[PDB]
Scaffold this active site. Structure first.
Site, PDB file in Angstrom:
ATOM      1  N   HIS C 201      10.685   0.668  -6.685  1.00  0.00           N
ATOM      2  CA  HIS C 201      11.388   1.909  -6.975  1.00  0.00           C
ATOM      3  C   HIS C 201      11.551   2.119  -8.471  1.00  0.00           C
ATOM      4  CE1 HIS C 201      14.321   5.171  -6.354  1.00  0.00           C
ATOM      5  NE2 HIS C 201      14.971   4.614  -7.360  1.00  0.00           N
ATOM      6  N   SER C 205       5.856   4.751  -6.534  1.00  0.00           N
ATOM      7  CA  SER C 205       4.856   4.438  -5.524  1.00  0.00           C
ATOM      8  C   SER C 205       3.485   4.948  -5.953  1.00  0.00           C
ATOM      9  CB  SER C 205       5.244   5.039  -4.169  1.00  0.00           C
ATOM     10  OG  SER C 205       4.321   4.666  -3.163  1.00  0.00           O
ATOM     11  N   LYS C 227       6.683   9.624   9.909  1.00  0.00           N
ATOM     12  CA  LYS C 227       5.420   8.891   9.840  1.00  0.00           C
ATOM     13  C   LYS C 227       5.627   7.395  10.053  1.00  0.00           C
ATOM     14  CE  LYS C 227       1.205   8.903   7.112  1.00  0.00           C
ATOM     15  NZ  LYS C 227       0.216   9.864   6.554  1.00  0.00           N
ATOM     16  N   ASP C 228       6.659   6.823   9.430  1.00  0.00           N
ATOM     17  CA  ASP C 228       6.967   5.417   9.642  1.00  0.00           C
ATOM     18  C   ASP C 228       7.486   5.161  11.047  1.00  0.00           C
ATOM     19  OD1 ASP C 228       6.463   5.711   6.901  1.00  0.00           O
ATOM     20  OD2 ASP C 228       7.805   4.063   6.379  1.00  0.00           O
ATOM     21  N   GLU C 271      -2.801 -22.459  12.882  1.00  0.00           N
ATOM     22  CA  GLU C 271      -2.779 -21.110  13.424  1.00  0.00           C
ATOM     23  C   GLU C 271      -3.820 -20.236  12.730  1.00  0.00           C
ATOM     24  OE1 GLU C 271      -1.525 -20.839  16.424  1.00  0.00           O
ATOM     25  OE2 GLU C 271       0.092 -19.407  16.050  1.00  0.00           O
TER      26      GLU C 271
HETATM   27  C1  HEM Z   1       7.943  -9.808   3.619  1.00  0.00           C
HETATM   28  C2  HEM Z   1       7.022  -9.291   2.798  1.00  0.00           C
HETATM   29  C3  HEM Z   1       6.984  -7.851   2.212  1.00  0.00           C
HETATM   30  C4  HEM Z   1       7.789  -6.781   2.386  1.00  0.00           C
HETATM   31  C5  HEM Z   1       9.055  -6.609   3.257  1.00  0.00           C
HETATM   32  C6  HEM Z   1       7.265  -5.700   1.580  1.00  0.00           C
HETATM   33  C7  HEM Z   1       7.799  -4.438   1.482  1.00  0.00           C
HETATM   34  C8  HEM Z   1       7.166  -3.364   0.904  1.00  0.00           C
HETATM   35  C9  HEM Z   1       7.471  -1.970   1.131  1.00  0.00           C
HETATM   36  C10 HEM Z   1       8.576  -1.440   2.069  1.00  0.00           C
HETATM   37  C11 HEM Z   1       6.635  -1.237   0.393  1.00  0.00           C
HETATM   38  C12 HEM Z   1       6.604   0.304   0.326  1.00  0.00           C
HETATM   39  C13 HEM Z   1       5.756   0.848   1.471  1.00  0.00           C
HETATM   40  C14 HEM Z   1       4.300   0.616   1.175  1.00  0.00           C
HETATM   41  O1  HEM Z   1       3.855   0.968   0.054  1.00  0.00           O
HETATM   42  O2  HEM Z   1       3.583   0.091   2.064  1.00  0.00           O
HETATM   43  C15 HEM Z   1       5.767  -2.143  -0.332  1.00  0.00           C
HETATM   44  C16 HEM Z   1       4.761  -1.807  -1.207  1.00  0.00           C
HETATM   45  C17 HEM Z   1       4.071  -2.699  -1.996  1.00  0.00           C
HETATM   46  N1  HEM Z   1       3.953  -4.051  -1.754  1.00  0.00           N
HETATM   47 FE1  HEM Z   1       5.049  -5.085  -0.459  1.00  0.00          FE
HETATM   48  N2  HEM Z   1       6.142  -6.142   0.922  1.00  0.00           N
HETATM   49  C18 HEM Z   1       5.942  -7.454   1.286  1.00  0.00           C
HETATM   50  C19 HEM Z   1       4.917  -8.254   0.838  1.00  0.00           C
HETATM   51  C20 HEM Z   1       4.046  -7.929  -0.174  1.00  0.00           C
HETATM   52  C21 HEM Z   1       2.853  -8.662  -0.540  1.00  0.00           C
HETATM   53  C22 HEM Z   1       2.412  -9.939   0.211  1.00  0.00           C
HETATM   54  C23 HEM Z   1       2.265  -8.009  -1.565  1.00  0.00           C
HETATM   55  C24 HEM Z   1       0.987  -8.316  -2.390  1.00  0.00           C
HETATM   56  C25 HEM Z   1       0.385  -9.506  -2.503  1.00  0.00           C
HETATM   57  C26 HEM Z   1       3.093  -6.863  -1.874  1.00  0.00           C
HETATM   58  C27 HEM Z   1       2.854  -5.936  -2.861  1.00  0.00           C
HETATM   59  C28 HEM Z   1       3.192  -4.607  -2.758  1.00  0.00           C
HETATM   60  C29 HEM Z   1       2.821  -3.546  -3.663  1.00  0.00           C
HETATM   61  C30 HEM Z   1       1.969  -3.707  -4.933  1.00  0.00           C
HETATM   62  C31 HEM Z   1       3.342  -2.408  -3.211  1.00  0.00           C
HETATM   63  C32 HEM Z   1       3.190  -1.027  -3.878  1.00  0.00           C
HETATM   64  C33 HEM Z   1       2.172  -0.199  -3.107  1.00  0.00           C
HETATM   65  C34 HEM Z   1       2.106   1.189  -3.681  1.00  0.00           C
HETATM   66  O3  HEM Z   1       2.826   1.469  -4.672  1.00  0.00           O
HETATM   67  O4  HEM Z   1       1.330   2.016  -3.142  1.00  0.00           O
HETATM   68  N3  HEM Z   1       4.160  -6.836  -1.006  1.00  0.00           N
HETATM   69  N4  HEM Z   1       6.120  -3.432   0.008  1.00  0.00           N
END
Ligand code: HEM
Ligand SMILES: CCCCCCCCCCCCCCCCCC(=O)OC[C@H](COP(=O)([O-])OCC(O)COP(=O)([O-])OC[C@@H](COC(=O)CCCCCCCCCCCCCCCCC)OC(=O)CCCCCCCCCCCCCCCCC)OC(=O)CCCCCCCCCCCCCCCCC
Ligand SMILES: CCCCCCCCCCCCCCCCCC(=O)OC[C@H](COP(=O)([O-])OCC(O)COP(=O)([O-])OC[C@@H](COC(=O)CCCCCCCCCCCCCCCCC)OC(=O)CCCCCCCCCCCCCCCCC)OC(=O)CCCCCCCCCCCCCCCCC
Ligand SMILES: CCCCCCCCCCCCCCCCCC(=O)OC[C@H](COP(=O)([O-])OCC[N+](C)(C)C)OC(=O)CCCCCCCCCCCCCCCCC
Ligand SMILES: CCCCCCCCCCCCCCCCCC(=O)OC[C@H](COP(=O)(O)OCCN)OC(=O)CCCCCCCCCCCCCCCCC
Ligand SMILES: CCCCCCCCCCCCCCCCCC(=O)OC[C@H](COP(=O)(O)OCCN)OC(=O)CCCCCCCCCCCCCCCCC
Ligand SMILES: CCCCCCCCCCCCCCCCCC(=O)OC[C@H](COP(=O)(O)OCCN)OC(=O)CCCCCCCCCCCCCCCCC
Ligand code: HEC
Ligand code: HEM
Ligand code: HEM
Ligand code: HEM
Ligand code: FES
Lengths: 77, 240, 380, 110, 52, 60, 380, 53, 54
Positions: C201, C205, C227-228, C271
């Site tokens: 945030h 995004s 959508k979600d 796994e």
């Molecule tokens: C328990 C694990 C995680 C949670 C709860 C989480 C949560 C979120 C959420 C809610 C968003 C916004 C919705 C979306 O763009 O899809 C997001 C975006 C993002 N996540 Fe995660 N995430 C997790 C793991 C990760 C991992 C494993 C990576 C990368 C190796 C990561 C990197 C990013 C990035 C770079 C964004 C920005 C995407 C954009 O701006 O379009 N996150 N994450």
């Protein structure tokens, strides 16, 4: 919210020294003892009477509990 | 040798995505297990209280629970006594410890058949193929006594004697107790013992598919309705 | 009269984070997976809370407690298989999350990417210890495998494996401390997810085109709310059909046997979501080399933002790097497969070439493709 | 608007039905289980205890008091009036049989 | 609170008691539907069929 | 010319409170109807295989 | 160059909450108890995590696992007695926190006060199931007593008790689900404490004079940082003297026998805060009335902001209501003593008078005293 | 005495750690209090003047 | 089951296998396990000394 726009203070001058130039314990006993005695004298008559009546109720309850567990000599027979 | 023989895909009555088990077949398989398989194998995670409600009436389950004697205690003076079993009691151990089972079964340990279908590759197909797949060893395969050739067993030298054959028990329904019929019934019973939640889970899945085939077009319609403002939005650029 | 939604402090934080958040109007279904991961985390928390309500972390009673949950507890089979297939769905959503980040150039959010990498480590550790928890044969033997692989470290490995084991092997203390860690670590995952969302945030995004999306932004509610919700419904459809029809194809039958130290399984595998790392560690024929290869193959995601050598953010207009990325995904599929079958012929050379090609594509080939792509578009 | 809100209402009805089902399954999960339902009702009992004695068992999770009473106690508790008690109830209505008395050990105070 | 007396708040309450009664009605109906309350659900025409 | 969605909107879908009442009553009746229909579909798919189909042989 | 402490978003939040937070310069040692509660919560979390690392929640092996912790685990006795005496110190600091709020009029922060009250219920519930966790004689019988109090509720109470017991008594299911609940609720306590701090930061902190302390504001660092460090060190001194010299003067000896469902202790004595609530319970001689008496005795804390009828916020300049406040604290001490004592004469009449006086001087006498004081200072 | 040992096998180690804790905390409490008074000395000797026009 | 000489890993030997044997050998009284009797009785070692000398 932060410093700068909290209050409106005018014509107030504040004086402070360095911690490395002033003493950490300036007259710690010769002024600490009268201050503690004055604070105790100021706030001793609001706490001590409730705590003393707690002590009295505690002793009275323990004593009369022991007397209730005591044997009444009315049952000779 | 090092090869494995894959059991074939048999057409069970529960292989469909909405097909339940044949409860009469589970009854016959439980009878097969009690009269044949219970002397060596254990079923410690299945009880008569599990049996009642899917195969037997409560009175019948109580009768077949009281027909076996179980060890209980202690009593007032502290002595292990013996009493007739109840519904809450589990199936009795044929051996007190696995070492006694190995001693009485020529070293081989008969595994507990409460998760054997869920714990073997193929499951009920593997059980059917193992029970009906006993054959004479081929040339060059010398097997010492106490071991029997079985192509579906990994290692091909099982420590199990062929447990079932023609007229190995008597069914109460008058069904012919042939080898294949007995094997199919006991495989159905072992599948039930591995997954007692089978028919209930299938009913959950049927309700879930009907419910989600209702919900998904309607939820998609709500999404398209909310997003119809943007998906039909027109843009114009008018510089001066 | 005041606007309570943007006046009340908790309400205005919720409004500024989730309700009135300016989101890009053109983010596809690949942007639902963050909320899918959050919903999967909540589902895991609830289902594992009930499983621990009916679960005992004793070596003698772990397997019998799991059977008691499956058979005696009302819908405890549903809870347990919801937990397991939700772990599979969690790793599916994690892999698609990481794939979105790699394809659409989301790793330029460096701190958000690093917090995500730490989240990925925490989820992998959580799922590993949870898979150890039912005390099956494959659970115990996979625990021994992973702990010995950690013990491969020189001068530190033996003391660390004795410290983590709580003894000399996987035993009572190991199982109990794994239960405690598996209970506590998803809450650390949740807190790190708040940190993840806070950094995101702060940065805003990203749109699939990789451009500046501030020209056309829409409120998060009700557009991405519905959508979600649709994405949550589809994810629940896949999770529930996995629970109620195919509950064992992503599981392992050998986990349904009690953990026998004396008897080994025929083929030991972890796994399915550990299979690519297992395959590369089998591919490099050195214990220290294998564990370092695993560690570097997961840290290379954190190393990723320093490999961006292109003047375009997303791969939407980068066809050569698109081809390289899809070859990378194909190679990850090969690595999962090779972690599937045991280490024999020709799986030796297939796994070795798969690991070498994987590292070569993710380190050398993609920046060279970006450089020649910029040259082809006449940037320098 | 009726068509659109009918779609919305049908979706909400569906989500409400599914939510009620899943919450009901979770609540029934953390409710009593099959083992504690089986071990509560059925009680094994013997008759190798003389008169004027007490036996303490487990019935429905509670200490079950099986008391073998004497004829003096039976006569006294049949002859005692119920007007002076807090709740009017005699022994012939409390128990069916005079020799054996089946009670709980859960006190009605704490 | 004596500030909420007076005819304006009284007629505001008169306006909002049908909506308040409707919200109480849907609260009670949702409560009995969620809890499967037999004491109320045995007096309907149809929902007797599931015996719950 | 008033159609069924028009009457539904003018009676039940207008106010939020009566909207929620319609949702709750529909949830009750649809829960019973869907349970009955899905159960009957399950019985017709698995005729002659379930305990409720085979208990009459072994009772009384 | 840019100020990273005021620019980096996590560092910006830590700066705005803990570093450059404008705090009143005159708050006393009573204002260190919030930080003491947070630090003691962290200590409870860590020590309980270690105890759960070495703890099994089975009725056959709960007591054996506790003995194994105290005897075989290295410094496991230190961890367990640190956890127990830290729970006692947590309740000491919590009661002094509530006393600070009541004396200095901090309940006018209504949202902060209500979040604190919810935290208070969460802490009592968590400590209750933590107390039943070692599966001792007093533990099992206290669980039975409190859950029968839950059974006092009409027409749904019996069903709620058979639901929460996981059966028809305190048994294996009750112990295991209480283990799960006792593990998971302190993290909800931590989240509620974050909300507590957020609601406090919305309006700033209070000062003993009760005046608008914005005229003389000092930053939280380094003054209150080192002041809270000294408070933490003093609390650690008291807690460790308890642990290493008197590890049983606040506990129960009868908790050291295994829980026998047949035998009962002659005295059912829970911990001292529960003895306070227990005396308020047994003062009213019916089940339903006693249960509402307990819940009301805790909920009049939340009812307190509407009973403030004085034009001066703090009790620093209010001497009559100071006398009533110290009478009230004395009455809570007497109620704790009655809860400790058995139900014999004269403890029934003393506890009844104590409960009547407690409710009367909170509901009636303190607002009346405030009205008298405002009339006395010529303000009414 | 043997039953006291069997009840509390950590008795001697607990007393030794208590003695170490007592000496250590009797060292830190004056020092931490001195640090608090040092950092707080600026405010304690602060002088205020009001000079309206 | 068989019999072997004990070692350092073994705990102190059981006088009775179950508490009902203790009831039988002590005419209905259960001798409590003396591993926490000091921490379990008020007075502790004082109570034990007074019980044995009283
Ligand atoms: C328990 C694990 C995680 C949670 C709860 C989480 C949560 C979120 C959420 C809610 C968003 C916004 C919705 C979306 O763009 O899809 C997001 C975006 C993002 N996540 Fe995660 N995430 C997790 C793991 C990760 C991992 C494993 C990576 C990368 C190796 C990561 C990197 C990013 C990035 C770079 C964004 C920005 C995407 C954009 O701006 O379009 N996150 N994450
Ligand atoms: C030939 C194949 C069918 C072609 C066809 O009919 O295309 C119509 C239409 C063509 O789309 P379009 O009109 O060109 O533009 C897109 C729409 O404007 C806007 O529609 P959309 O597809 O962009 O909607 C956003 C997206 C939202 O997607 C999600 O929310 C899903 C998020 C991912 C979930 C992943 C779960 C885990 C997966 C593990 C593997 O929706 C979908 O992906 C469709 C979900 C359908 C659910 C079932 C409905 C019955 O495609 C669809 O509607 C797709 C679904 C077709 C069924
Ligand atoms: C008495 C003889 C010495 C004397 O005259 O002392 C005067 C002195 C007060 O005289 P003052 O200079 O007019 O007052 C300014 C304060 O000293 C200015 O310092 P302060 O008292 O405002 O400092 C904040 C407070 C911070 O204290 C806390 O945060 C304690 C938190 C509560 C205790 C822990 C929680 C558990 C409570 C369970 C009950 O620290 C203290 O109360 C002093 C701690 C001394 C530690 C031991 C040093 C040897 O009294 C003390 O310092 C009392 C403590 C030492 C005796
Ligand atoms: C909140 C407590 C809800 C308890 C509950 O749902 O009980 C089931 C019952 C199911 O209805 P029922 O009519 O079958 O049961 C009522 C009789 N008792 C509760 C004694 C078993 O629902 C309720 O009691 C509804 C209570 C609403 C208030
Ligand atoms: C997968 C099957 C194929 C999916 C597909 O259709 O991909 C094509 C799609 C094209 O998207 P795009 O380039 O944005 O086109 C714009 C045109 N409107 O391209 C995409 O959607 C690209 C993004 C796909 C992300 C998921 C696929 C990869 C998943 C595994 C990633 C693993 C990364 C490493 C993790 C372990 C370490
Ligand atoms: C212990 C005695 C503490 C004491 O001396 O209290 C008096 C002190 C007076 O302070 P004050 O009048 O505000 O001004 C300072 C000097 N003018 O007043 C104070 O220091 C105020 C102390 C407020 C908190 C006291 C908490 C005592 C324990 C209460 C537990 C239960 C609380 C209620 C729970 C429901
Ligand atoms: C009228 C007294 C006059 C004293 C004059 C002293 C000299 C004054 C001039 C020199 C200066 C000396 C220091 C002065 C300090 C501040 C002034 C002071 O102490 O005033 C007296 C003090 C406050 O006065 P005030 O608030 O008006 O008291 C009315 C009581 N309602 O009031 C008091 O100290 C009286 C406190 C009495 C408390 C009695 C409580 C009895 C009941 C306790 C029950 C507790 C619960 C027990 C359990 C109940 C259920 C079983
Ligand atoms: C005593 C003669 C037995 C009878 C009766 C039954 N089984 Fe058995 N079984 C027995 C032994 C000694 C072994 C171990 C053999 C080995 O080499 O491990 C087994 C094993 C099995 C297995 C496991 C096969 C595997 O690959 O793990 C199964 C599935 C099995 N047996 C099935 C089975 C059934 C269904 C029976 C009732 C008809 C039955 N066995 C009877 C000993 C004996
Ligand atoms: C607060 C959160 C969680 C709790 C309390 C919890 C608790 C548990 C418990 C008690 C078990 C034993 C039941 C069993 O073996 O089937 C278990 C198993 C397991 N857990 Fe969790 N868990 C949580 C979150 C997670 C998460 C976030 C993941 C993965 C991303 C996960 C993955 C697993 C897996 C794979 C198993 C093995 C299930 C099986 O083999 O059948 N858990 N967990
Ligand atoms: C786990 C429990 C709690 C935690 C972690 C906690 C935390 C804190 C902290 C750190 C502070 C700042 C320190 C201070 O202002 O003195 C504070 C202040 C406060 N707390 Fe709590 N608290 C808890 C329980 C409670 C309870 C039980 C209440 C009331 C019944 C409460 C009400 C308040 C109030 C009103 C303040 C403001 C005090 C002021 O402004 O001076 N809190 N809390
Ligand atoms: C994440 C946080 C926590 C965890 C994992 C945890 C875990 C445990 C465990 C496993 C036990 C049983 C071990 C034993 O008593 O021998 C226990 C006991 C106990 N817990 Fe906690 N606890 C936590 C937080 C708390 C908190 C915040 C409180 C009170 C405010 C508390 C109060 C107690 C008490 C009083 C006992 C009894 C100790 C005894 O009787 O020896 N716990 N806890
Ligand atoms: S519990 Fe029996 S009189 Fe109190």
């Amino acid at each position: 919210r932060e410093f700068g726009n909290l209050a409106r203070i005018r014509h107030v001058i504040s004086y402070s020294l360095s911690p490395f130039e002033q003493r950490a314990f300036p007259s710690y006993f010769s002024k600490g003892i009268p201050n503690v005695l004055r604070r105790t004298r100021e706030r001793i008559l609001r706490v001590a009477p409730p705590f003393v009546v707690v002590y009295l109720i505690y002793t009275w309850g323990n004593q009369e509990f022991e007397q209730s567990k005591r044997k009444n000599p009315a049952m000779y027979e | 040798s090092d090869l494995e023989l894959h059991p074939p895909s048999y057409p069970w009555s529960h292989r469909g995505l909405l097909s339940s088990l044949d409860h009469t077949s589970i009854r016959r398989g439980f009878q097969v297990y009690k009269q044949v398989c219970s002397s060596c194998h254990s079923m410690d995670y299945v009880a008569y209280r599990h049996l009642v409600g899917v195969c037997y009436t409560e009175e019948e389950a109580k009768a077949l629970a009281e027909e076996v004697e179980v060890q209980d205690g202690p009593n007032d003076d502290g002595e292990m006594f013996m009493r007739p079993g109840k519904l809450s009691d589990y199936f009795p151990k044929p051996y007190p410890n696995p070492e006694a089972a190995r001693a009485a079964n020529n070293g081989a340990l008969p595994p507990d058949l409460s998760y054997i279908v869920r714990a073997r590759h193929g499951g009920e197909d593997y059980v059917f193929s193992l029970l009906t797949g006993y054959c004479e060893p081929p040339t060059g395969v010398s097997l010492r006594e106490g071991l029997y050739f079985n192509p579906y067993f990994p290692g091909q030298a099982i420590g199990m004697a062929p447990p079932i054959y023609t007229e190995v028990l008597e069914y109460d329904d008058g069904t012919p107790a042939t080898m294949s019929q007995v094997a199919k019934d006991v495989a159905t019973f072992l599948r039930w013992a591995s997954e007692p939640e089978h028919d209930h889970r299938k009913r959950m899945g049927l309700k879930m598919l009907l419910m989600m085939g209702l919900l998904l077009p309607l939820t998609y319609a709500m999404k398209r309705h909310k997003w119809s403002v943007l998906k039909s939005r027109k843009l114009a650029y008018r510089p001066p | 009269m005041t606007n309570m939604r943007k006046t009340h402090p908790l309400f205005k934080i919720i409004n500024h984070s989730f309700i009135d958040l300016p989101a890009p109007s053109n983010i596809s279904s690949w942007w639902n997976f963050g909320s899918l991961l959050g919903v999967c985390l909540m589902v895991q928390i609830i289902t594992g809370l009930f499983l621990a309500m009916h679960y005992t972390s004793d070596t003698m009673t772990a397997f019998s407690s799991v059977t008691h949950i499956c058979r005696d507890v009302n819908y405890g089979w549903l809870i347990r298989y919801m937990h397991a297939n939700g772990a599979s769905m969690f790793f599916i959503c994690l892999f698609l999350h990481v794939g979105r980040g790699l394809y659409y150039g989301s790793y330029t959010f460096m701190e958000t990417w690093n917090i995500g990498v730490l989240l990925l480590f925490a989820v992998m550790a959580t799922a590993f210890m949870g898979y150890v928890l039912p005390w099956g044969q494959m659970s115990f033997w996979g625990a021994t495998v992973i702990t010995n692989l950690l013990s491969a470290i020189p001068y530190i490995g033996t003391t660390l494996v004795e410290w983590i084991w709580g003894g000399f092997s996987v035993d009572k203390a190991t199982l109990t401390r794994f239960f405690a860690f598996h209970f506590i670590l998803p809450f650390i995952i949740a807190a790190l997810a708040i940190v993840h969302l806070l950094f995101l945030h702060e940065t805003g995004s990203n749109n699939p085109t990789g451009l500046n999306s501030d020209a056309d932004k829409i409120p998060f509610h009700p557009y991405y709310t519905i959508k979600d919700i649709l994405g949550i419904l589809i994810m629940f459809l896949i999770l529930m059909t996995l629970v109620l029809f195919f509950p064992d194809m992503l599981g392992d039958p050998d986990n349904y046997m009690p953990a026998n130290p004396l008897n080994t399984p025929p083929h030991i595998k972890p796994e399915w979501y550990f299979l690519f790392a297992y395959a590369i560690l089998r591919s490099i024929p050195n214990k220290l080399g294998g564990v370092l290869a695993l560690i570097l193959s997961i840290l290379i995601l954190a190393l990723m933002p320093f490999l961006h050598t292109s003047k375009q953010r997303s791969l939407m207009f980068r066809p050569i790097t698109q081809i390289l990325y899809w070859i990378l995904v194909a190679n990850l599929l090969i690595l999962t497969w090779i972690g599937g079958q045991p280490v024999e012929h020709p799986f030796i050379i297939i796994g070795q070439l798969a690991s070498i090609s994987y590292f070569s594509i993710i380190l050398i080939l993609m920046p060279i493709s970006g450089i020649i792509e910029d040259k082809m578009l006449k940037l320098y | 608007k009726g068509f659109s809100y009918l779609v919305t209402a049908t979706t909400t009805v569906g989500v409400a039905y599914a939510a009620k089902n899943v919450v009901s399954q979770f609540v029934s999960s953390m409710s009593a289980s099959a083992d504690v339902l089986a071990m509560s009702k059925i009680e094994i009992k013997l008759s190798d205890i003389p008169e004027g004695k007490n036996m303490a068992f487990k019935w429905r999770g509670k200490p079950l008091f099986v008391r073998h009473r004497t004829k003096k106690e039976i006569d006294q508790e049949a002859a005692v009036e119920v007007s002076q008690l807090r709740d009017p109830q005699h022994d012939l209505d409390r128990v069916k049989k005079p020799e054996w008395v089946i009670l709980i050990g859960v006190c009605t105070h704490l | 609170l004596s500030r909420f007396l007076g005819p304006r708040y009284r007629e505001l309450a008169r306006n909002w008691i049908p909506t308040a009664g409707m919200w109480g009605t849907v609260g009670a109906v949702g409560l009995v539907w969620a809890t499967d309350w037999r004491l109320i659900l045995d007096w309907v025409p149809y929902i007797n069929g599931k015996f719950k | 010319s008033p159609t069924i969605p028009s009457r539904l909107y003018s009676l039940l879908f207008r106010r939020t409170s009566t909207f929620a009442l319609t949702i709750a009553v529909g949830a009750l009746f649809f829960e019973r109807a869907f349970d009955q229909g899905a159960d009957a579909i399950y019985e017709h798919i698995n005729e002659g295989k379930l305990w409720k189909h085979i208990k009459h042989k072994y009772e009384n």
